[PDB]
Amino acid sequence: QELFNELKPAVDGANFIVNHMRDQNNYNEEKDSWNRVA
């Protein structure tokens, strides 16, 4: 399966993008919680 082997970098990049978005959202959520505490 050459197709999946060629698309594996794309899948890895998409997973990296998703992890970046999820981490950013968790970071922003904690910042919002600190804002509400204030």
């Binding site: 999946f4 899948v11 890895d12 998409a14 997973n15 998703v18």
Partner: peptide
């Protein structure tokens, strides 16, 4: 492709991005 966990994780990830920005 169906059995591979990374493809499913990527799919659910794009769903997560779309829903979060909505």
């Amino acid at each position: 492709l169906i059995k591979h966990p990374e493809v499913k994780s990527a799919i659910e990830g794009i769903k997560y991005i779309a829903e979060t920005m909505k």
